[PDB]
Amino acid sequence: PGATLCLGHHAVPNGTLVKTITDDQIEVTNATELVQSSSTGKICNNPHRILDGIDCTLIDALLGDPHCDVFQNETWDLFVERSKAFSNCYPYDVPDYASLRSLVASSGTLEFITEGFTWTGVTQNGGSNACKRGPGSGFFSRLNWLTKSGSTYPVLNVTMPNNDNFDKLYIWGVHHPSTNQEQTSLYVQASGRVTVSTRRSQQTIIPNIGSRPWVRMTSARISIYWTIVKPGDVLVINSNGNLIAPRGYFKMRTGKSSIMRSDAPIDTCISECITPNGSIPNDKPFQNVNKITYGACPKYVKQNTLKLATGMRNVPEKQTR
Amino acid sequence: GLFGAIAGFIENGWEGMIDGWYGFRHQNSEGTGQAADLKSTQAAIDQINGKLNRVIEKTNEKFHQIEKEFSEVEGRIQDLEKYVEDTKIDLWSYNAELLVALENQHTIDLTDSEMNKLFEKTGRQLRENAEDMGNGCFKIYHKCDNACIESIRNGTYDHDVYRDEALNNRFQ
Numbered sequence: 001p002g003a004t005l006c007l008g009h010h011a012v013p014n015g016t017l018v019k020t021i022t023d024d025q026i027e028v029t030n031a032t033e034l035v036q037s038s039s040t041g042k043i044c045n046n047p048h049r050i051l052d053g054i055d056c057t058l059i060d061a062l063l064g065d066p067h068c069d070v071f072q073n074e075t076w077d078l079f080v081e082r083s084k085a086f087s088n089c090y091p092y093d094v095p096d097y098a099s100l101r102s103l104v105a106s107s108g109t110l111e112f113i114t115e116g117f118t119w120t121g122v123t124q125n126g127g128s129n130a131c132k133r134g135p136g137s138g139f140f141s142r143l144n145w146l147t148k149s150g151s152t153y154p155v156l157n158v159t160m161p162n163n164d165n166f167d168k169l170y171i172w173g174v175h176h177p178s179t180n181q182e183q184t185s186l187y188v189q190a191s192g193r194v195t196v197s198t199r200r201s202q203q204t205i206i207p208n209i210g211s212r213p214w215v216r217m218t219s220a221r222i223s224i225y226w227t228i229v230k231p232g233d234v235l236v237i238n239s240n241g242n243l244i245a246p247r248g249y250f251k252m253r254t255g256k257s258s259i260m261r262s263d264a265p266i267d268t269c270i271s272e273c274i275t276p277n278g279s280i281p282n283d284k285p286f287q288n289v290n291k292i293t294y295g296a297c298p299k300y301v302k303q304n305t306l307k308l309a310t311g312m313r314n315v316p317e318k319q320t321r
Numbered sequence: 322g323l324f325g326a327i328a329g330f331i332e333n334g335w336e337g338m339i340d341g342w343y344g345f346r347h348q349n350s351e352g353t354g355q356a357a358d359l360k361s362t363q364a365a366i367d368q369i370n371g372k373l374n375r376v377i378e379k380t381n382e383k384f385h386q387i388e389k390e391f392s393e394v395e396g397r398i399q400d401l402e403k404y405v406e407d408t409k410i411d412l413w414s415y416n417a418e419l420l421v422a423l424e425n426q427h428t429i430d431l432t433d434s435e436m437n438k439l440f441e442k443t444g445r446q447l448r449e450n451a452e453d454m455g456n457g458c459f460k461i462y463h464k465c466d467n468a469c470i471e472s473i474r475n476g477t478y479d480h481d482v483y484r485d486e487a488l489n490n491r492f493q
């Protein structure tokens with residue numbers, strides 16, 4: 001009269017299907033999800049400095065559209081641009097808009113330092129009813145619209161050295177009148193010119209006279225350009241008409257700043273990882289929420305689920321049922 | 322699995338064993354019973370925790386990147402931006418698919434392996450006093466009361482004590 005000693009392993013009533021080398025589906029006792037597929041729908045306000053653009057694009061905040069004056073000197077880790085944003089100043093274009101937006105976004109600041117440019121023999125601080133500031137006409141806060149004084153617009157020729165130990169970003173522009181009458185009336189000369197240069201490089205823009213589509217009372221336009229001046233270099237601005245002059249420079253930084261397009265609301269919580277859909281947890285190695293992300297984030301993948309087996313093969317007792 | 326214990330020579334698992342992953346069932350003179358083996362259970366859990374912690378190890382922090390959605394048709398630069406991102410996503414999706422497939426095959430094999438290690442360990446403990454029935458059970462050829470069973474389970478079974486009794490019962 002002996003004894004039986006049986007070796008065995010557990011099983012569970014509710015197993016999970018996982019994938020392996022040999023099986024597209026096979027049952028194990030437990031598994032864990034490696035793909036983050038949901039978000040709260042809200043951008044957590046910590047630990048990153050989130051700046052909500054509200055009605056303003058970064059570029060409009062940069063130029064100083066009046067309804068974006070609240071953004072003066074602002075800083076951010078992530079600037080959030082909303083789909084409701086609008087421009088409400090002189091109509092403009094930026095050749096290479098995407099690059100200017102990118103380099104400012106990445107710098108993370110709109111810190112502006114006014115410099116004492118001397119514009120001899122021209123009228124300063126031009127404005128327009130296209131860009132109302134209070135009840136009267138106005139303009140971009142960081143730009144200075146120069147026009148004739150008396151009946152002359154002389155060759156402007158000014159310099160600003162960079163004797164600081166940081167890079168200066170200058171934003172300037174060129175005005176494109178709708179008609180020849182407007183050109184001569186504002187700048188005297190029949191064809192203007194703007195040349196902005198450093199020791200190393202130079203840009204020359206000739207204005208083009210003609211109507212563009214009427215936007216906020218005007219068929220004329222401004223084109224926006226930028227120039228970076230490094231320590232020890234010097235900015236020279238030379239023009240016989242059509243200059244939209246800088247008032248100073250923006251300070252450039254390097255670091256972790258960026259920009260994101262999202263309509264998600266900002267809320268009180270903590271999350272390292274931000275998507276346009278909202279913050280997501282970063283405990284899993286992968287995510288399927290959005291390929292656009294900011295911060296310490298799971299990597300984007302196409303799968304909406306991937307199960308890592310956390311148990312043995314689940315073998316229930318066969319039944320006659 | 323590679324060792325042929327789980328879903329192999331062991332017909333099935335035990336839903337009744339809620340206090341361990343591997344363990345023992347016995348029939349003797351005093352009745353039937355069940356006990357978890359803690360050592361085998363812990364070795365499997367430790368290995369699985371180890372791989373889980375390696376897999377969820379945070380390694381990715383990105384700040385300013387490229388744009389990935391576009392409101393205008395632009396041509397060549399945008400084609401390239403999209404192709405770069407699409408390429409990246411496909412490579413990462415593949416890595417994710419491969420990783421889980423390899424991890425899961427290995428987890429199934431290591432758990433099968435731990436079953437087999439316990440079985441082989443128990444066989445070696447019982448020397449000539451038992452025989453392998455082929456279904457995960459040993460026929461033990463002697464009076465093995467509850468204290469004797471526990472002695473097998475906690476590694477204190479002296480096979481010499483019962484050898485003569487068992488040898489006689491085995492060879493007729």
Ligand SMILES: *[C@@H]1O[C@H](CO)[C@@H](O[C@@H]2O[C@H](CO)[C@@H](O[C@@H]3O[C@H](CO)[C@@H](O)[C@H](O)[C@@H]3O)[C@H](O)[C@H]2NC(C)=O)[C@H](O)[C@H]1NC(C)=O
Binds near residue numbers: 030310
């Ligand atoms: C089998 O694996 C699953 C994972 O797929 C395990 O379920 C998870 O268990 C953890 C720890 O108990 C849960 O986290 C905890 O949740 C509570 C309440 O939600 C929270 O207050 C704690 O701080 C903690 O984070 C987790 O929610 C749960 N997974 C899901 C999807 O709900 C399960 O424990 C494993 N089974 C065994 C037997 O180990």
Ligand SMILES: *[C@@H]1O[C@H](CO)[C@@H](O[C@@H]2O[C@H](CO)[C@@H](O[C@@H]3O[C@H](CO)[C@@H](O)[C@H](O)[C@@H]3O)[C@H](O)[C@H]2NC(C)=O)[C@H](O)[C@H]1NC(C)=O
Binds near residue numbers: 158236
């Ligand atoms: C328009 O404005 C610019 C900027 O002030 C004028 O450039 C300046 O021209 C003078 C000579 O006419 C340069 O002076 C030279 O400097 C060296 C040392 O650097 C000195 O050793 C020489 O004896 C010489 O005087 C000066 O460097 C230069 N400034 C810059 C920033 O390059 C330009 O002449 C003006 N042109 C007109 C037509 O108004």
Ligand SMILES: CC(=O)N[C@H]1[C@H]([C@H](O)[C@H](O)CO)O[C@@](O[C@@H]2[C@@H](O)[C@H](O)O[C@H](CO)[C@@H]2O)(C(=O)O)C[C@@H]1O
Binds near residue numbers: 126218
């Ligand atoms: C600095 C200056 O000259 N400001 C003008 C402005 C500009 O001359 C113009 O935007 C250049 O393209 O023009 C303003 O007046 C405009 C009229 O000339 C135009 O015929 O009608 C517009 C309204 O439909 C417009 O008001 C302006 O933009 O407000 C007058 C301003 O002092």
Ligand SMILES: *[C@@H]1O[C@H](CO)[C@@H](O[C@@H]2O[C@H](CO)[C@@H](O)[C@H](O)[C@H]2NC(C)=O)[C@H](O)[C@H]1NC(C)=O
Binds near residue numbers: 277288
């Ligand atoms: C997160 O947001 C993305 C982007 O809006 C969602 O995916 C898009 O959904 C639209 C509208 O239903 C679809 O037409 C497209 O297939 C998706 N667009 C892109 C650019 O991929 C996504 O479903 C959201 N995910 C979660 C979890 O909220």
Ligand SMILES: *[C@@H]1O[C@H](CO)[C@@H](O)[C@H](O)[C@H]1NC(C)=O
Binds near residue numbers: 072111112113114
């Ligand atoms: C922006 O910062 C600069 C430098 O600190 C300062 O001179 C300037 O007045 C500031 N303007 C505003 C509106 O904060």
